[PDB]
Every structure is written in structure tokens, then in C-alpha cells.
Amino acid sequence: GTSAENLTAAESRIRDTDMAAEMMAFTKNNILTQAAQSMLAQANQQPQGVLQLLQ
Amino acid sequence: MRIQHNIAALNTHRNLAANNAAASKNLEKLSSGFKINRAGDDAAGLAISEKMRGQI
């Protein structure tokens, strides 16, 4: 029983994930995704030099 | 002097190109989320960042 509990703890620490750290990373990546979305929406509008030609 | 060359428009074109380049650099820095994407951005600080990443 003692050995099984100790090895279970070891295997948990090796393979299982901490919820808090992954939550942090996921929120960070979502915020970065939104930022890149807005930046791309701006960059698509940036090349508008049609007022050179017409008037 | 009058027709064949229009120097004001040349200067304006230069400044326009420079402003566009600066805006593109800012877009790169905002989309990437990092202030140093190339070594031309900052040489002393790229190395420090890499060593610190290794240590972390």
C-alpha cells in the first residue's frame, strides 16, 4: 500500500497537469489571438491609396 | 524647374514611405507580442533574453 501510494504520487506529478498554469496559458493565448485579429483587421485596411488616382 | 521634375512630390513620397515602414514595424511588434523580433531591433538584449530563457 505504501509503495503504491508513493508511485501514484510520482506518476501524478509526472503526467497529470496543473489546472491553474494551463488556465493562465490559455487566457494569455486567447488575449494574444484577439490582439492579432485586431492587428490584421487594421493591416488589411492600411493599403488604401485610391485617393491618389481619383478625386 | 517647372514641369519635368516636381521635387515637393518626391519629398512627400519619401516621407510617406518612411511613415508606412514605421507603421508596419509597429504592427509587427503588436501582433508578435515581442519588442525584439530581429537582432537589428536590439543586439544587447537578444543574447540576454536567450540566456535568461535557457536559465528559466
Automatic annotation (TrEMBL), chain B:
Origin superkingdom: Bacteria
Protein name as catalogued: Uncharacterized protein
Source organism (scientific name): Kurthia sp. 11kri321
Residues of the full protein shown: 1 to 56 of 276
